[PDB]
Structures are given as structure tokens and as C-alpha cells.
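Reproducibility note. Readers wishing to regenerate the assembly model reported in the main text can use the exact inputs given here. Chain order matters: entities are listed in the order in which they were concatenated for prediction.
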Amino acid sequence: KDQTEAQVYTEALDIDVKNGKIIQPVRLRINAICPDLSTVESIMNAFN
Amino acid sequence: NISLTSAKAPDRTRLIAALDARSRRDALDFEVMIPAQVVQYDRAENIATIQPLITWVDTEHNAVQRHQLVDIPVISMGAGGFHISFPIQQGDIGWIYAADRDTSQFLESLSMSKPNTGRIHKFEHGLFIPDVFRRYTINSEDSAAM
Amino acid sequence: NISLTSAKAPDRTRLIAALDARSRRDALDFEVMIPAQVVQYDRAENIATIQPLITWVDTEHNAVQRHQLVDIPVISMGAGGFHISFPIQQGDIGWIYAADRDTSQFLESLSMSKPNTGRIHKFEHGLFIPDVFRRYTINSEDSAAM
Amino acid sequence: RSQTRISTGSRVQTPAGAIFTVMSDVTIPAGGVATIDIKSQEYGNIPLPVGN
Amino acid sequence: MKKRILRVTFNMPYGPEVIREDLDVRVRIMKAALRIQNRATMEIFGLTTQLRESLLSQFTAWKHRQRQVGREDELMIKVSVEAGYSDQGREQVSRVFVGEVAIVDIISPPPDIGIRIQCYTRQIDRTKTIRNMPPANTTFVKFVEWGANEMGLNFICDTSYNDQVLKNPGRSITVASAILASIQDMYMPDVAAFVDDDILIVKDRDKVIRPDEVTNVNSFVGIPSWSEWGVEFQCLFEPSIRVAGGVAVESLMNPSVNGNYVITALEYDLASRDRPFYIKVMGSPAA
Amino acid sequence: MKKRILRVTFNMPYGPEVIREDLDVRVRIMKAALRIQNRATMEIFGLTTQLRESLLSQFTAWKHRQRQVGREDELMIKVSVEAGYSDQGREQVSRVFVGEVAIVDIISPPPDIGIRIQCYTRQIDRTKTIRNMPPANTTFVKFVEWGANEMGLNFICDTSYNDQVLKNPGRSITVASAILASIQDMYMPDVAAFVDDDILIVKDRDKVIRPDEVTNVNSFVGIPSWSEWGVEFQCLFEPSIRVAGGVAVESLMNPSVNGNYVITALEYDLASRDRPFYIKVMGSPAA
Amino acid sequence: MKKRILRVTFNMPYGPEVIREDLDVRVRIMKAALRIQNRATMEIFGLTTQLRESLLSQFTAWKHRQRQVGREDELMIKVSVEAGYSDQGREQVSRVFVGEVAIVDIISPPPDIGIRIQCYTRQIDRTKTIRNMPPANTTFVKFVEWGANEMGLNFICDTSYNDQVLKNPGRSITVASAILASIQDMYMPDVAAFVDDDILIVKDRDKVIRPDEVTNVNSFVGIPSWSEWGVEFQCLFEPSIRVAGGVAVESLMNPSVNGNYVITALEYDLASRDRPFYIKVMGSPAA
Amino acid sequence: KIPLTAVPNQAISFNAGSSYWKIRLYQNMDMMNADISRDGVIVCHGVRCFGGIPLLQYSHQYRPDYGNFVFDRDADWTLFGDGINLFYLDGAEFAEYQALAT
Amino acid sequence: KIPLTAVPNQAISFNAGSSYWKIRLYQNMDMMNADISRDGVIVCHGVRCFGGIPLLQYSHQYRPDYGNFVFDRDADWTLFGDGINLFYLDGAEFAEYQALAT
Amino acid sequence: KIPLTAVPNQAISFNAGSSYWKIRLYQNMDMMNADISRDGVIVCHGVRCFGGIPLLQYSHQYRPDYGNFVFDRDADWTLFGDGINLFYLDGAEFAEYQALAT
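Running the prediction on these inputs yields the following C-alpha cells for the assembly.
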């Protein structure tokens, strides 16, 4: 609107900005060396 | 090979084929005029039960009879207090027409009135015209006289 | 909640619902046959002003009166130079039919003629048939005779 | 003669009858047929000796 | 992490055949308050030779054994759809559609052969005829009751037009399908007549059929907005949403549209291996 | 570097609310010489909560304040669209459409909420009725004049059929919208009747309404080509192009199609932040 | 390595003008056993100014030469399409469509100007009228013969309804095109009447016109599958496939669908510089 | 009650009591003020804001059969939605309110 | 004849002789067995299969005017499609068949 | 005035004077030649082109009420569009010009 009282306009431009920032999921990456076997099949079983 | 419906294989190929199918279906349900017969009649109110005389064809080429219509008015020509009537009884034939809208509220009072319902162009509320067709003998003398 | 129009919320969702709406609208404007009444009539040329006796219903269920039709011909049965006429006057009732095309040029000369305009299936150029319905007394002696 | 009586044919007695017909019937050449009655309400009411 | 359940059931002559969620199945369902019957398009992938032969050959659309001992199942088969969620082995499945197969196709070529199917609700009536004469002079409710008995469906009717006498209501009905069109025609548009699942429902436009089963909705995937008829939004698969039922709406971005609405039309987009698992709702103000 | 100008106005009860070109606005307009009323679809992005409340709640499509003191604006609001260029602070704006909102939607979800709107020209007549009896026996031009007075439009008529007597021309018109269908029906296809902006125009097919305002066209974005009815081409936004006006065509690729043409149909694809800012024209030979 | 052949011929007043396969030409053809006439949409690229001037100006759709000496070619030009393969200079070309141009367009802008064209079979009849009185009281076959003579087409009729008397069969036919609708209307759906190329064919649904020309098909690009009316598959350009002809099907992936089928509808997708060069077939069980 | 918000100048419309109203609230120096519209026709201009004193004063306005509006306490736009409300009473309720008031 | 396959338990449906049949073949210990249906209404259960003798024994079953089924040799589901077949004979052919049988 | 171009052999079609014409122009040895056809029916073959004298010579050809064509100067296909033109005169002014000829 841009002609109202200062604090009224400060109340606006909030809430509206909340409509326009929505958080997407989190991505996590790792790198590792697996020494034994049972860990490998456990991971694959969890994967399936 | 009875096909369960009046559907054709080339339909659903294009839009125009479907459009023609729906056009034919919408036209068929539109009712105007067919011959009919009298089942019951009372001379005192000009209302007669009517049974149409043309059946319905099926995918097996069978014949399905139509439905009787009750309280159908009979036309009695006349105006200015001078009319003509024929002593109709059971089994007489003729023609039946279909009114545009619902006429029951009009038939109660014979004055201006709303349509009762939204049903249009059906034989439920029509008008019966008596006829004899070719069943008569004409004498040789009045071959050219009314 | 008067909705400003005869529209449904479920419409606009699919093509078939829209097609059914347009089909209903196209059928509703097809005029065939409804009861009417006589406003003016001159016995010398068989033309009568006609006012239909069934109104229009709106979204508030109000009644909107129809429009008077002028110079509508009256049917006088007869052929081979022998006809029947009833002395119609103001306030007589009956039925009115609707011609397929424009017949003003035909009524102007009663011979083969070109159609005037492109208007089709409207009560503007029709045909009136008198009737009396159930308004008569029948004597007990002739309960089986013309 | 040859009338097709229908269901729910409502017959009203003078003391608030409001009575349906229970099952359909068709009129016979005699001119008299039998039909059944059920009350539109769930209280105790009685029918008059004559048709109303 | 809850898993989704999508089961499609087929009634072969020998018994039922169930396609589970483990395969690739996509389904779109459209329901509304109209005389036009509901529709469902089905995408099925990975059918083997045995199952293809078992199922696709019964969608014949011709007539066999013209003598027709009985009816219904001796013409077209019936398909039922139920979708839900499973959590910790605990299920919340619910049926969403019942119909009969109408149209067959083939969509994808090898290596993966996929087919498309069209189903409609109460399509068995387009072949069955009428053998019980309709009443001549009667009220609206008795006409509705006769229609319900003729089709063979449990019915509920609740209208302000229950005490109006009609003359010759259905004396020009050829088969059993035009009964619904007759019922809807008389008091359009205030009176809405539709067939949902296997129940005939006739009612006023703005009346909730079950006043005490209002579902409070407060989590929308699709932001609610005005739609010049009421409100319209979208959510995940909520089994509580039905047609003609009510909803209580509480929003965050759009709190000016909170209120009670009556459900008019629905759409379902359920997939077992794709993103869409949704429900779209259009509403009208409650009266 | 000239900039484009695009404003959309709404005649709300408190006053006008103008959406400037600074936001994301897309508009498609279709105009033709027919009885079917013109259409305009708008894409509007970035409306805030206050303005969403102000605008989206007034496209109700229900009826209220039943006493109905007056008509026109007390049913549905009016929208006016004007587009043009601006160079060095000098404007060359022009109006292209007037109509009323009919259909509302929501297109894009957060974080950018956008809506779609359908507007039609002279949609106020689909509710207003006829209260002045049509002439019974008269000529064409007087029927046109009565229709213009009834709808409330300035009219122009120039046909070879101005001295033809009609009997019972309009005795079967329910609302004020079928007057145009009546006018077009009598003398198809030579006589073309259409409503443009606020003017009713009835004319013969191949007559230019303003013979002295022929717009010479020599710069083409869409290469002109034979169109099986005349010619058809495309250009940037030219404020001078109208419906039923004339065009003088000179080409470089296709010099064989130079001549005078009368405009039959039009197109508009105007955007404030996208590539399309165009006009598509189809013409007929000028008699 | 066989090469594909695609020629399009135009019968211009001075003579034929054949667009060879060396250019960019795309054509889609749809044929069926119905009264609705066949269609062909054509894409032509690279036409120069000379050929654009020569061809595009003759699809006028207005009328010249009001004296009208003769008929047919003095209204609209005719197009004939032939497609096939070529190996070692040895050809196997075959004709697939005959029709007249109806609609023109411009599709692609410079630098490559391409046009789109719509053609219909026996569209010349939509202008020609009837000058020979239809038979009053006659059988079916004589009505078909009169219609064939009136249109000007060689006809073949083979129906079980060949000895049925009709009363006033064609007393309400205004032009030469409604003859086919008349012929199809009487005995739907068993009797199918359609016009293919230059032959009028009336027959029962499940009868093969040429019993001894059954084309055995055993190589399908599109895997055969049941499709609610019979079978439906796809192949490369096989000149032997026609409408109403029979096919013998042997499959490998779907060996349960082997049998004899009668062809109902066809589709052609032929291009000279694109992937599609195909034929789609739908069939019904042979009787 | 009527939905309000904390803004020194606003104008909400609604369909209540079988009629269509449009109300306007704005701060004027010391007290509030109000503008009331019905059926698109203006009714009053600048009627003040008092707790318990009904907004519509005169019989040609408040009803043959319509309703009326009243503030529970002297309203200020800072407290709207928190303790300060606007209520609508249909014809019978308003009539009995007036009867009991004196 | 009838299309068959080498599976120990199956069912095939077909429309032959102006009639709708559904047949079931399954191995039961030593010999085969058959289930025959019509109209969707069961006809017989567990018809033992032998080579050269018809499957339908009773007069009210095989025909007023219908047909009947005969296996040329004793059934063995390993050999179907190779040397062992099932044939269908319409009413006249079955009548002359039974005439030739004795 | 008919549009032409610089090609040694061409054919232009047009609809002028309520009639449909097709004209052909081609170089033959030294002079030009023309082929004129109307309504799809050929009129004449090989009329030599000269400056000032009409192309259609004979009364049954040029008009009861049709028009005729004249070249202002002798034809030369390298000059069309620059200094050499072909004009069409409808019946009234053509007959006036024949009157002016003598």
C-alpha cells in the first residue's frame, strides 16, 4: 500500500514475507571405508 | 455379437465421431408426434388414458412396449361457445403431440400459470387428436360432396 | 443464495458436464407447442393476436410473462370448397404451434415462396388451433352420439 | 375398468387418516378390488366404518 | 516412516484377483454431485503373460450366451478400489470407488507393457431395462423410492420438496439409467441427485447429509483460495473426506476464508511409485 | 529504449484499484465479429494478503441484498485493460478491453501465489431482462435501434438491408443477451453483428466502417501468408488496429499479397515480464 | 538399404505439380468405416517464393466465375498421395489418399517457412446439388445404386438387408453429401456405409469384402493387444492393408490373440525426414 | 460478532440479518467514528463510538425489522480482537434490548 | 479342437456352437478329471477322462441340440499340444457319432 | 493495370470486370505472343502483341459487355515493371475508345 503509518506498514511486509520462504528437506552425505562383511549386508537390508 | 449398446468401433477415434454420437442421442430423446390408442376415457372431463402404438427396438432387434399416459386431454374444436365432440370409447386410435413444458398447473385452472417442473418435450403432458384413418364407407352419390 | 444464473458448481470440471449444459440450453430454446389465448381477432382475414398462457421462471422462482404475437393465422378446416368456422372473440383459448421457417412471404401471397429470414422454430410465425377443453354441458340423451 | 392402482395411493379419513396403500393392485372387470393400508404415523388410530 | 497402500480388486468368475501396491499402478478418480456417472482411469504396469491373458480377455464388450440366465455379472465385471496408509503394520485402508470396466487400451511398448482402463459407476444399468410401472400421481419422495428400488440401491432423500405432487413423472424412460436424469431434471438446480458408490443421494444444494460428522481440516498441501463458488483447496489422502459431507477449515496464510463448507466435487490422484497421492476439494457455503 | 506499459483497473465499490506493470501480469484477449462475447484471461502474480482480501472476495457469483436497489454494478464488478508503450517519459497508452469477472482460480502455489481470472464483455446482460416491448412490424434499422437502446449502447448500422420489413422480430427473447443472436440470425452470413467495447456494430461483411482511417502496415513480425479466407499476419502492439477497420499491406518476403484488407478477428498476447507482446490479425478482401 | 518414397500431387489448372520426397513433408491420414469423411493434415517445408505464389493462392474458398461453366475442378483443386519404398531402383509405390484442400495456414516463421494444409475426401459434393429424383418406393439396393450414380462413384453393396422395401428414402436431401448419412441411418449399427478413395462401400459389419485377399501379418512394431472390440496393433508401411479387408495374425509375445480379423479403422503417420513411418490398425472378429 | 483487526482505518462488509451491510471504522482525533452503509445506500456519516450506546439512533434506520450494532466498551483500534468486540442483534433481540435498556 | 497347454491345473473359456462353455482340467492322483460349465451354471463335477468316450453321459446334459467333447486318447498334461487333443462336435455330428459308436 | 514480371514465359490469373481471366505471355522468335482464356474456356491462341491495338480482335470474343486489353508499347520482357504496362478496360470505356480510334 505504502502510504499508511510507519508501524502499521512494519506490521505488514512481515507475515507476507513468511509467505515466500518455505524450508525444504536436509541432505547429508558421508564417505567411509567398510572393513567387515556383516555391516555391508546390514546396510543393504536397511536399504531394501 | 450383440454389443450391449448402440456403440460403433470407429467412435472414440476423433472428436467429431463422438460429437455425432451425442447429437444422435440428444435428438432421439426429443419427442414430438406418434400415433396412439385410447385405453380409458370419460366424456365429462376430456381426459383419456393413452397407450402409444410404436415400440422400442433393442440390440437383439426385439420389441419393448412403451408406457401408458394418464389424464391426457382430448381436443374438441370450437370457439365462441360452439363446439364439436365425438363419442370416443375404448380402442379408438389417433395421434398424440408433446407439449413444450409442464401443463398440470395450467390444467387445474385454465389460466396463466408457471410450469410445474423442468421436464420438457415429453409425452407425459401432451394432447390427443382423434382419427379414423381409412376405415369408412363413402357412398357413390356424394363422391364430390362434403 | 440466488446464484445469478442456472449454473452448477460440479460443472466446469469435465467436458461432458459442459456439453450437457449447452445441450440443455439448446433444447430449451426449441419451441413447439403450448396453450395460448386470443387478444384480438378479425373474422375477415383469419389473423388473431395471441398471448401465451405459460410464463418464465427465474432464479428467484418469479414469474415473467411472455410476449404477445400479432397476425397469427387461425386454422379453419376444410377442403374442396367446404369449410367450418367458429365465431372467435376476445378471451378464447386454444393451442399454438410453431412453424419451421419464416412464413410471412407465404402468407402475403399463398403461393410457393422463398423464406424471408433465418429464424427457425419460434412462435413468431405459428398457427393457432381453437379449443374449449372441458367447458361444456352434455345432455344425458346423446351420451353416445355426435 | 382395467385401472392400474399404484402404491402410496393416499387415502385420508376425516379424523386425520393420511393412509397409504401397502401393495400395488390392478382393477378387474368386476369393478371392485382389494388394497391394503398402512398409517403414515406411528400412533394408535382407528378407521371409520365407512369410506371417507 | 509410513508406507502407502493402493489395492485394486477384480471380480473374475472364479474369484477375486487383487493387484497390490507392489507393482506400478496409477489411478485418477473424479466424483461430483451430478447425474453423470463417476470415472476412473487406471494405469497398470508389469503384467505378465498369464495375468494379461486372464484379465484383458474378459473386457469383451460383445455379448456371449444370448440366453442371459440372470444379469449383472454375466455382462461386465466389477472393479473396487481401496487406498490408505500403513504404519508399524497398522492399516487405515478405505474404499474410494466401485465400477465396471468400459474401455481398454495399450500404452507403453516393451520392455515394460502397460495398459489403460476406463471404469464407470453403475454402468450395469445402461443395459438393464425397467419392469415395474412408475406411479401415476404421487409425491416426489415416493418417485425417488421407486427409482431406488428399481435400480437396487439404498437411498437417502432429504429435501424441502418432499410434499409436491407430480403427474406422469417417469412414463418415458427407456432403460434404468435415465431414472437419475429424470430425478435431477424436475427441481434443478436447487435439488442435486447423484449416485455415490452404491447409495442414491437426493438433497438440497447446501445441506450436509451427516450434521455430526464434520471433519476439521487444518493442514493443506494446496493453499486454500476463493473460487467464485465457495472455497477450493487440496490435501493428502484423508479418508474422512466424502461427497456432500462438511468440512471445518482453519488456515494460516489465508485466515479470512475460515468457516464451514459443504463438499461439492472431488478428485483423486493416487500412485504407488510416483509423487501424486492427493485429494482436491471444492466447497460451497453451509446453510 | 522504450518501455512497455500495461495497467489493469477494477471498479470496486470504494473506487478504482489499479494494478501497474511493475508486477507479473499476463493477459490474452480474443476478439471477433460474432455474437459470442469477447474473452480475456489474466495471470496475476505476487498479490499480498491485503490485496488478495480486497479483490478475491468480490467475485462471489452468488446473489445478495435481494431488494436490488438498481442494477449493473450491484451484481458483478467491471475490469478495464489498457496497454501501450512509453518512451522518454512520453506515453502512448490505449484501451483494449472492457468486461466483468466471471471465473476465479488459483494457479501457482507458494512461495509465489498467482491467480487466473476470466472476463467477458457485456456479461451484465445475462441477468438483466427486457422491459420495453419490441416493435411488432418494422424495418431492420429500427429493430437495431431498439436493441441498442435496450442494452444501453451507442450503435452504428450500415447495411444494404436497411429497408427490409420484418414481422415479429423479437417476440421470443427472454433476457437482454439474445438480442444480439436475434440481430445476427436474420441475414447470415453477409450481415455481421457484434459488440465491441461499448459499441454495437452491424454491417455488411466487406465494408470498412471508417473509410478514411486506413492503417498502412509495413513492419511484420509474423510473415504474411495466404489464409484461405484472405490474409493473416502478426505484428507488435499497434494501437491503431481495431475490428472492422482497414489495413494497407506492403510486404518484402511476399510481395504478391499486397492490398487492402478488412479486419475480421484479432488476438492479443501482452505480458509485462515475458517475451510475448503481440497482435495477430486475420483479414478479408475489401469490397 | 531401402529408401522411402513419398509423393504429393496437385492437379493445378496448367497441369500436375508433384512435391517429391526430397523435401520435408509430413502427413497424417485417418480413415474409418463411417459417414464422416477422411482427413489428411500436411506439413510442407522449404517452399520457395515461386511455388508459394503458384500454390497457396489457389485455395481461395471464395467463388469466382459466377457463370460456372461445368463443376468440380472449377471450385477447388484436388490432391493425391502415394507412399512406398524403393530398393535398388525397384519401386513399390501405392496410393493412400485422394481429396481436396479445405484450410490453409502458416506454421513456422523464417528462416524455414512451412505451411499446414487440411484435405477431405469427396468434399466436392458439399456444393453440388441433386438433380435426379430419388426413387419413391423401392428396395435398399436400388437406393444405394441411385446414390452411387448421383455422386459419381463406383459402388459395391453386399448386405443381408438387400431385399427390404423402403418408403420415401431420400425425399429430404438438399445436397449430394447427405446421401451417405441417409444410407447409414436406416440400419445402424450392423450396416456400415463409407466412401473410400473413389468407391462407395455398403456391407455388414463383420464381412470381408474380398475373401481371398487375406493379408497374413506376422511382424508388428506395436505389440498386439486386446482392445474391447477385437485387436489393435501397429506396423510399418504395408501397402496391402486396406479398409474392410481381412488380416491373419500370428504373434510371439501374445500368442493367445491369433486369428482372423476384419479391419475397422486405420491411421497413417508418414514422414520423409522424421522417425514416424507407420500404420495403426484396429480390427473386429471375422464372421 | 464481527471480525475486526488492529488498523486505524478499515471497512469490512458482510451479509448478516437478511441484509447486506458495509461498516467503516477510523480514528478521528480523540474518539473513533463510524460510517454505516446498507444495500449500497449510505445511512449515517461519522456516528461516534461509545460502549453500550447503539450505533443506529433513528427509526427510519435501525428497523422496521432490521437489526442494530453496539460496542461493549469504548473501542480503540489497539485492542481489536482482544476484549473489544462488535455485536449484531436481529430485530427481536434488538427490540428486547431497547425494552430492557430503560 | 480346443487350445490347451501343459499345466497340471487350468481352465479355458470359449464360445462354440452357439453356446458359452467353461472347462477345467486338473490331475487327480492317477487319471485326469474335468469340470464342465455352461451359462455360468455348473453341469458336471469330476468327469473322469478316457480316450474315445464322450465327457457328457446323461441325455439332459449333452443335447436337446448342443454338442459334446471327446478325447482321442487318455489325457496326459505333459503331452498337450503334441499328440493329444480335445475336439468339439455340434449336434448333428455328435448324433451321427453316437450312431457310429454302436 | 495488370501486374507483370520480367520472365520470358509466364502466366497471370486474375478476377477483373466481373469475369475470370487467365493470360499467358511468352517470347516467340522475334515478337511476343499471348494466350487468353476466360471462365476456363480458351478464347484465342497466339495473338501478336503490338502497341496501341487491342488483343481481342473479334466481336464474339471481346464483348457483349466484357472488356479488352491493350499494350501501350511493344512488349519486351526485360522491361516489364519499367515503362511497359498492360491495362484492362471495361465495356463502356472500351467501346468509347473504339469510337475514338477512327
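We highlight two features of this model. The two ends of chain C are 56 Å apart (CA to CA). The first strand of chain C starts at residue 33 and ends at 42.
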